[PDB]
C-alpha cells in the first residue's frame, strides 16, 4: 500500500558542514515517520520517532523536520562517526511497517596516500598447495586506488582480486587488501614477487617486493 | 534492557523452508508492551519487514511474502520463530528479530538482536583455514581466513583485547566458490616481541573454531 521513497541514495560531505535527507510518502503519512543510523555489519539504531522527536543519548546534531508527504532528516554538523546508512521507516498505530531504500553518507576528507605492506605466502599455507601474495594499503584517502602485481618483472592479469572497508569512523579513510592466487607448484616458479599501488596522494607510483626465500 | 538473539541453520536449500527462532530477555513475550518482529536486509541493500506477532496471536505479514511467512510464538521458551518456505536466492540476507513497542509510545523497532546471515544455496558448509601473514616504527600483521563456506566469519585479536587498527576485510568469493578473506591490524614495531598477536577464527555455519598465533618471521 504505502510506499516510502528516500532521497538521495548516497551523498558525499565534508566534516562540519551541514546534510539533509529527504523521505516521501506515497499519502498523507501522518501515520509515523521515524529515522534509523545503521553503520555496516550491525543492527540499526532508532534516532528520532514520530517525525522531530530525538531517541535518547542521540547527538543534538541530528534534527527531524515534516509532516504529510515530505519528510528531512538534518545533521546540523557532519562528525566522522555519522559515516553511516540512514533509513526512515513508516508505521501506524499497529503494523504493517515501510523502510526507505537508505541513504548512505559518506565523508569527505584530507587526502591520506596509503601504507603499503607485502605478505608472502606463509609456509602454512604453502603446505597445503597454495600460494597467496598479500599486499595491504592502510588508511587512505580518496577509496579510488590502483594496485599491481607484477611477478618476475611480468605484469600479471586475472589472478588478483581485491576488497575494501567501509569508511572508517573515526578518521574517515579506507584500507584496502591486494590478494594475488597462485599454486605453490608456480609460486616456485618465479623470485620477484612486487605489488605496485598508483594513488593520488602518492607523487609516484609505490613498489613493494620480496625476493622468495630471502627474509 | 531488552535483548533478542537469533539462532538460525545459516545455509537453507533452495526451495526448502527457513526456520529461525529469537530468544528474548529482560522481557517475557507475553507482554501486552510488544510486537515482535522479523526484518532482513540483502548483502548492499536496505531494510525490508517481513512480519510480526502479539501476544493474542495477531500475525501482520509483508505484502510481499504474506505467501510464504509463518510467525510463532512460544512463551514457556520466551521465544518467537520465523517459518520462510520455498526459500530463493533473491532470499538470500541478513536476518534480524527485533521487538517493537504496541502501547507506550509510536510503533519503532526498540532493540535488535544481531544479525543472522541465511545464504540460500546447495553448497556444503566448509569450515575455514587459518594462515599467518607474519610481520616483518609501524608495523602490518594478520590472518589469511580461506576456503570457507558458506559466510560469516567472525575474526578477533587476542579474544577482543585488540580491537585499534584492525581491518577484517569483506570476504571474496573465489574461483572455486569458497570465501577468503584477510584480517589485518597495524601495531608497533616495538611490540613485536614483547607483544603476542592472536587472532581468533569463528565460522558458525561449521561450528569451527581457530585460534592462530602470528610471530614474526
Ligand atoms: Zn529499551
Ligand atoms: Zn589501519
Known amino acids: 500500500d504505502i510506499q516510502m521513497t528516500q532521497s538521495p541514495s548516497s551523498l558525499s560531505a565534508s566534516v562540519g558542514d551541514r546534510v539533509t535527507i529527504t523521505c516521501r510518502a506515497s499519502?498523507?503519512?501522518?501515520?509515523?515517520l521515524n529515522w534509523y543510523q545503521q553503520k555496516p555489519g550491525k543492527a540499526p539504531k532508532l534516532l528520532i520517532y514520530?517525525?522531530?522527536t530525538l531517541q535518547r543519548g542521540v547527538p543534538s546534531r541530528f534534527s527531524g523536520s515534516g509532516s504529510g508527504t515530505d519528510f528531512t532528516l538534518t545533521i546540523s554538523s557532519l562528525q566522522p562517526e555519522d559515516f553511516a546508512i540512514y533509513y526512515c521507516?513508516?508505521?501506524?498505530?499497529?503494523?504493517?511497517?515501510?523502510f526507505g531504500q537508505g541513504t548512505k553518507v559518506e565523508i569527505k576528507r584530507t587526502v591520506a596516500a596509503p601504507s603499503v605492506f607485502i605478505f608472502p605466502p606463509s609456509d602454512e599455507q604453502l603446505k597445503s598447495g597454495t600460494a597467496s601474495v598479500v599486499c595491504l594499503l592502510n588508511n587512505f584517502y580518496p577509496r579510488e586506488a590502483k594496485v599491481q602485481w607484477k611477478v618476475d618483472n611480468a605484469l600479471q592479469s586475472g589472478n588478483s582480486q581485491e576488497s575494501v572497508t567501509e569508511q572508517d569512523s573515526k578518521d574517515s579513510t579506507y584500507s584496502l587488501s591486494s590478494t594475488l592466487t597462485l599454486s605453490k607448484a608456480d609460486y616456485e616458479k618465479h623470485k620477484v614477487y612486487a605489488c605496485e599501488v598508483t594513488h593520488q596522494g602518492l607523487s609516484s607510483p609505490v613498489t613493494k617486493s620480496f625476493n622468495r626465500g630471502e627474509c | 534492557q531488552v535483548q533478542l538473539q537469533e539462532s538460525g541453520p545459516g545455509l537453507v536449500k533452495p526451495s526448502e523452508t527457513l526456520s529461525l527462532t529469537c530468544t528474548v530477555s529482560?522481557?517475557?513475550?507475553?507482554?501486552?508492551?510488544?510486537?515482535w518482529g522479523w526484518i532482513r536486509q540483502p548483502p548492499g541493500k536496505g531494510l525490508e519487514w517481513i512480519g510480526s506477532?502479539?501476544?493474542?496471536?495477531?500475525?501482520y505479514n509483508s505484502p510481499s511474502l504474506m505467501n510464504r511467512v509463518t510467525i510463532s510464538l512460544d512463551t514457556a521458551k520466551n521465544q518467537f520463530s520465523l517459518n520462510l518456505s520455498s526459500m530463493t536466492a533473491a532470499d538470500t540476507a541478513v536476518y534480524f528479530c527485533?521487538?517493537?513497542?504496541?502501547?507506550?509510545?509510536?510503533?519503532?523497532?526498540?532493540?535488535w538482536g544481531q544479525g543472522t546471515l541465511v545464504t540460500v544455496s546447495s553448497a556444503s558448509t566448509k569450515g575455514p583455514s587459518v594462515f599467518p601473514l607474519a610481520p616483518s616504527g609501524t608495523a602490518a600483521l594478520g590472518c589469511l581466513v580461506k576456503d570457507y563456506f558458506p559466510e560469516p566469519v567472525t575474526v578477533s585479536w587476542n579474544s577482543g583485547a585488540l580491537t585499534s587498527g584492525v581491518h577484517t576485510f569483506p570476504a571474496v568469493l573465489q574461483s572455486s566458490g569458497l570465501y577468503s578473506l584477510s584480517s589485518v591490524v597495524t601495531v608497533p614495531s616495538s611490540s613485536l616481541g614483547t607483544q603476542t598477536y592472536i587472532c581468533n577464527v569463528n565460522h558458525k555455519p561449521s561450528n569451527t573454531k581457530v585460534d592462530k598465533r602470528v610471530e614474526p618471521k
Open positions: 514520530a517525525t522531530s
Open positions: 521507516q513508516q508505521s501506524y498505530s499497529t503494523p504493517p511497517y515501510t
Open positions: 529482560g522481557d517475557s513475550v507475553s507482554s501486552t508492551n510488544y510486537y
Open positions: 506477532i502479539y501476544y493474542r496471536g495477531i500475525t
Open positions: 527485533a521487538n517493537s513497542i504496541a502501547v507506550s509510545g509510536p510503533l519503532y523497532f526498540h532493540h
Open positions: 499519502q498523507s503519512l501522518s501515520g509515523y
